[model samples]
Target: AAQTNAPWGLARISSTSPGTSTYYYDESAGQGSCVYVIDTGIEASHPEFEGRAQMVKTYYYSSRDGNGHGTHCAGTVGSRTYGVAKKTQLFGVKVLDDNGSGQYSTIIAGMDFVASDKNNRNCPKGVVASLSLGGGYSSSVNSAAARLQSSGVMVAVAAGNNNADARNYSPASEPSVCTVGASDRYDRRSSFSNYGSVLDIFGPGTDILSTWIGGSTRSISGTSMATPHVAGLAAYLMTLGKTTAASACRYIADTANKGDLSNIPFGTVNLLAYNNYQA
Candidate 1:
């Protein structure tokens, strides 16, 4: 089969020549590792997923992705055509509602479900809990994120779409989580992505294209879109045998391509999800 065009997010982090861009998908893709997309939901039947995705239905929320946000984010995380971990397993843990409106408590509740072993999902290699969702300062949300990280799950969160400081946000402000901000193809911080010392890394988030609801594809923007890039990278790292969240974070930080962005007080990150690690 012919290769599809690389999404800007993936292209920016991979090798691009004068006329073609090549991704690390073949070298870094797999399915033993899992990424829990905690958002509106995911279209598990979407052809982009090709049946590698699963929906975790909790009593508090439905697993179906009604709004396209969760599906789009999931696609960026691990879908075959639009993701970072091309062959990784995707689990939809819906926290946002049909209108993309939900409280911090809703997210926390979803986190609880993810942390609980009672669900019996049995992903022994560990999981990457991707939150393309966030809200105002809520200690509960922060605590949940920290708690989840402590349990060994690599938590990748959006630094919020607001241009304000990320310290004003919950999980993004919380320590121990990979709080991701948005960057463009040129490695510049996205104007709408929140900044501050709290951010963990920057990923491509401007005008990103990914899988959508109704079995289609669409373009969207935000720190929300930028987050899954890191989450999927984390998942891919896990498949390479990095089990703990701390190890994955260290690998990500150590291998980041370092960009040129002056506004971000914390500095730039590896624009590409560098996978060729020696250790």
Candidate 2:
């Protein structure tokens, strides 16, 4: 092997056994980097969430949290102390209202906001917009997201929840954005997760125990819950060293779990290989 020439530098890989912490602790996350979570809006008053939310904007698009979808999605990205990027700053944008649905235009606007904020220095250090919502793959969304990617900020999307061909949604299907799929501990494609090539890499999204409203915790299942895991990691990776979206995406794919040679289509996302790295 001639070193592969990864966009992200090589970092040592290690692991903690199952039932232990799944994510590597990057203390520097909370220091200054800002992230924009585009979903049903985050409740900025939870105890575990106190002093951690930096709500840049909140909109009421169809993207709501009726079935605990958005909340669970947020938890994966910035769930109090349990999130992958617990220390990273967060901005909540309520594009989906309380119904868990939002217009494509609204989603586009939210993403555009992220690009402007980052490009114009309107917000501190710009923002890495995270989307745990989207439809089957759509070229329209991809086109819009490509413009944003060219603008400099990172755009992360979820591969659909359906386990069919993954060429139907926007953003996620777009080549420019960082599309993430869900995987279990075994590194197998989730039965409900859409699979078929276009998927960039997989992350933990099965039976994930994450935060919810009204003081309750529940196990959520969806590619929605998994996208943030990668988004959070993107933020953390930016903080550690790698700067561009290309590097961030490469870090994820290169380090992701390839599973056993016998079982999985892909494997797991190895965050440890990206841990504390400085490109």
Task: Please tell me which predicted candidate would have the highest lDDT against the true structure.
Answer: 1
Candidate 1 local lDDT, 55-169, one digit each (tens) = 8754344667778999999999988888888888888887888888787777888888787742466665568889988888988899999988877788999999888889899
Q: How far out, in Å, is residue 262 in model 1?
A: 5.0
Backbone clash count for every predicted candidate, in the order shown: 4, 24
How much does each candidate deviate from the true structure in C-alpha RMSD? 2.9, 6.7
> Which stretch of 10 consecutive residues in model 2 shows the poorest summed lDDT?
5-14
User: Any idea what lDDT model 1 has?
Assistant: 0.78
Model 2, 1-279: lDDT tens digits are 112221011111113222323343556653456667788776555555556764555555333344466666666666654466666676777777676787888888877777776654443333467788887555666777777777776777887887765677766778767777776554456678766566776666667766676656678777786687777777776775655555677667666544421223443232322343322
TM-score against native, each model: 0.90, 0.80
How does model 2 score by TM-score? 0.80
- lDDT, candidate 2, residue 38? 83
Give the runs in model 2 whose Cα sits over 4 Å from its true position. Answer: 1-23, 61-67, 119-126, 260-279
